[PDB]
């Protein structure tokens, strides 16, 4: 269900097909008491505040029981129930044996999200500067600039709205045209050639300029492409590595023994 | 007394009343050991020789107060750290040393606060439309030797009650005139950082003691109470809600929760 | 081998002499299994994903064995072998499905090595109604296939001795002409990023081998030695101090510590 589109005119790639869950609240629960030994160790090691929330601190069934108590839709309950791993990673446990457990509440769910990657475009060079995750919100778009804040599992993304930036939909036009009149796209500029590569979700972007030699290879077939002056995109189905000068980039994870 | 002031003219809220402690140094101490040893060994194996926070196994409550007493600082400083060992541990590191022949040696690293008891405030912001503007520099501010230190990454400051503890390592220094941006974005004494839009935008932001709601264009925004129900239907404006009288806010189909929701005990 | 240059004209300092290793890939390995107890605890505490990769999860020798399997040069293998601590810190371990316990270990592959890196620190510079400027792009820079990779988040780079290990995931690519911003902020070959003020500002910044002190307006700033007390009183300007000769700096009532302060030892 996940796709990636490449836009040569702006030297940027967009990974689409994700579905959202945006944290807009917290649900708290007070808890009192072999298992006690593990809880005690955790709090001693982390000075009274832990994350993720471990199974010792809260068991798989106790968690589902709390999910059921939460004041939310059934589709929401169902979604959290299938992603306890992420839910735990976005939760906190705080000592006050008494301690308080703190779980996320998702204000909105099943909205489109996409991730944006960018590379230099030269003729002078321009690079778009607003990389990261975007999600549709209440008719606008929430943008999440810090990579830490969004967790992905298959086609589901879970983001924290605490430090998000709200933007109009017209930002999408920057993908096609950097000089568009409806929104002022953020860019960075240079007066000299620059070459590099960026690994994206389903491939890689290669910006190759000036005298630099750039090549792409396959583990079995060796060198399959030599690039010249341009901005190009390569699929992870047909390419395993990219080379920019003497720097080697790996498009796929390299499976070991 | 912690308070929150809302400023409609800039669509921003400021949480005030905090008192500061800014880390400007480190105090180190070498520790040797010939049950507790088992826990220390595990910690270092799991964290590849460097840990934070500093656990009670690595350094006991009384050993810690003893070190706080050794540190070259004021008594009010000593008193402050003594009442906040939890935070102090969270801002400290423990580093394993060489593989000795007959002992386990490691170094413990504790914060030294270069200044204390200065005012801090936290700034939240939401979009203001008339074309829209949003102020950009959210986060913690603290007074510092006649200027203001600004801490843009939320991770860097720890709060407990009315005390804040921040790390000066990656701070930005600014003049006091930055306060004037709260009331007037177009003031002549300082260039307030803003982000702009040519189209309507709607959103909400949860603050410390409430929430801000920016509602523009065709979007429906409402605020509700548990008891009662819908109190307020908003139209085109920037409004603030107190967490004493409102529990939830709705922007289009997105629901925001102003209070933490208390669950089964 | 490691030096630091101060540039008064820009109120900035550059630490040089480091050598690079830039992560551009991952090497994965599937693993099946007293030791089992520790592994189980780690996954229960961290909800199935851990970093760093512990000795329980992967032993010192198993690690070197994997380093030997990796498709890379010998100098690379030699470098990682001397820095297992860092390698573990940059690696992940992820549990799978289901005494029959499977998990995947994830190690960095360094696309390039032994290139120069430097770190950039900056402080406010004020002049003339006063105007004041601060350069905004602090952090690590490394040479990379004829250009320069910049790493703005401090988290991403780990240092040990004169070696730096950085993650290219969130890097920004820049031309070499950025170096000219060290000497001249208003240079014509590159547009240096700056932040501005219309009022005086004073502060200090601790660098790798010293500290920078920006002292302006009515503020009093001093520098001291433990063995000699006050050795300098500053006036309106931007100055640098070496950590060999100075231990503390004072800006108004705020005290900064240039060196780590050695304390009392304990025994158990």
């Amino acid at each position: 269900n996940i796709t990636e589109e490449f836009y040569q005119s702006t030297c940027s790639a967009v990974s689409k097909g994700y579905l959202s869950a945006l944290r807009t609240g917290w649900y708290t629960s007070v808890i009192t008491i072999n298992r006690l030994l593990e809880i005690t160790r955790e709090f001693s090691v982390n000075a009274g505040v832990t994350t993720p929330v471990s199974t010792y601190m809260l068991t798989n069934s106790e968690l589902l029981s709390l999910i059921n108590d939460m004041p939310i839709t059934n589709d929401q309950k169902k979604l959290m129930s299938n992603n306890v791993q992420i839910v735990r990673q976005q939760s906190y446990s705080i000592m006050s044996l008494a301690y308080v457990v703190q779980l996320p509440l998702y204000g909105v769910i099943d909205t489109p999200c996409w991730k944006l990657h960018t590379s230099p475009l030269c003729t002078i060079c321009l690079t778009r500067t607003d990389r990261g995750w975007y999600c549709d919100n209440a008719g606008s778009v929430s943008f999440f600039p810090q990579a830490e804040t969004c967790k992905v599992q298959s086609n589901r993304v879970f983001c924290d709205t605490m430090n998000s930036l709200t933007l109009p939909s017209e930002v999408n036009l920057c993908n096609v045209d950097i000089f568009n009149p409806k929104y002022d796209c953020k860019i960075m500029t240079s007066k000299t050639d620059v070459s590099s590569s960026v690994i994206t979700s389903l491939g890689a972007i290669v910006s190759c300029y000036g005298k630099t030699k750039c090549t792409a290879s396959n583990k079995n077939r060796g060198i399959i492409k030599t690039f010249s002056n341009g901005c190009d995109y390569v699929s992870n189905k047909g390419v395993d590595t990219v080379s920019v000068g003497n720097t080697l980039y790996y498009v796929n994870k390299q499976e070991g023994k």
Side-chain angles (χ1 to χ4, degrees), chain A:
Chain A
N1 251 315
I2 291 160
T3 66
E4 200 161 77
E5 308 189 295
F6 176 62
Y7 300 72
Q8 200 161 249
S9 55
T10 60
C11 203
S12 54
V14 174
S15 323
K16 62 169 182 201
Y18 300 92
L19 291 171
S20 77
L22 307 180
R23 195 195 65 69
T24 65
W26 296 111
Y27 174 94
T28 60
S29 196
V30 188
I31 285 166
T32 57
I33 293 127
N34 173 263
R35 196 183 166 196
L36 177 81
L37 284 170
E38 300 293 351
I39 292 168
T40 301
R41 194 188 335 270
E42 278 180 354
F43 282 135
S44 306
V45 170
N46 297 275
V49 190
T50 64
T51 180
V53 171
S54 66
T55 41
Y56 307 135
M57 211 88 76
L58 194 70
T59 58
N60 192 3
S61 64
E62 287 171 349
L63 181 59
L64 296 160
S65 160
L66 289 175
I67 288 167
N68 284 335
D69 193 52
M70 302 184 336
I72 48 158
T73 303
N74 294 322
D75 277 1
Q76 290 196 233
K77 286 170 182 187
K78 178 171 141 80
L79 178 72
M80 294 176 72
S81 284
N82 293 357
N83 290 274
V84 301
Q85 198 204 50
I86 302 281
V87 172
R88 281 173 186 282
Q89 285 168 6
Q90 288 181 329
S91 299
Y92 291 95
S93 169
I94 307 115
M95 177 173 62
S96 36
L97 188 44
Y99 61 100
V100 184
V101 149
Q102 203 168 295
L103 312 183
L105 289 166
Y106 302 109
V108 66
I109 291 289
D110 297 346
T111 274
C113 302
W114 58 98
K115 192 183 203 208
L116 173 68
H117 313 263
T118 63
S119 209
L121 180 62
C122 312
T123 202
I124 83 157
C125 308
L126 316 179
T127 310
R128 299 179 61 193
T129 53
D130 46 352
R131 303 152 165 283
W133 283 98
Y134 294 74
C135 297
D136 278 339
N137 204 305
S140 318
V141 174
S142 304
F143 169 61
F144 308 88
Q146 222 60 281
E148 179 84 343
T149 37
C150 295
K151 319 268 160 85
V152 57
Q153 157 59 37
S154 174
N155 68 333
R156 303 299 314 194
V157 191
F158 298 77
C159 294
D160 193 326
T161 74
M162 188 157 92
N163 283 128
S164 59
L165 302 181
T166 307
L167 307 172
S169 299
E170 284 77 11
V171 296
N172 300 346
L173 298 166
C174 294
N175 287 336
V176 173
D177 185 20
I178 279 154
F179 283 87
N180 56 234
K182 289 172 218 169
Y183 186 93
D184 291 301
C185 318
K186 273 159 51 181
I187 50 152
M188 164 179 65
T189 69
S190 172
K191 297 191 215 165
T192 312
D193 167 328
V194 78
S195 296
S196 93
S197 192
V198 192
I199 291 321
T200 74
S201 317
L202 302 181
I205 303 181
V206 182
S207 287
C208 197
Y209 292 107
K211 289 149 216 185
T212 319
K213 283 166 171 196
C214 313
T215 61
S217 305
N218 203 308
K219 55 194 167 177
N220 274 304
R221 284 166 183 182
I223 297 171
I224 61 164
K225 254 185 162 159
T226 304
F227 298 106
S228 59
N229 285 276
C231 169
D232 277 289
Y233 175 87
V234 160
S235 181
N236 73 358
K237 305 264 178 183
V239 174
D240 281 342
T241 65
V242 163
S243 195
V244 173
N246 311 107
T247 300
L248 194 59
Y249 296 80
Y250 299 86
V251 176
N252 289 298
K253 285 163 154 74
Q254 307 289 286
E255 196 89 3
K257 65 173 178 179

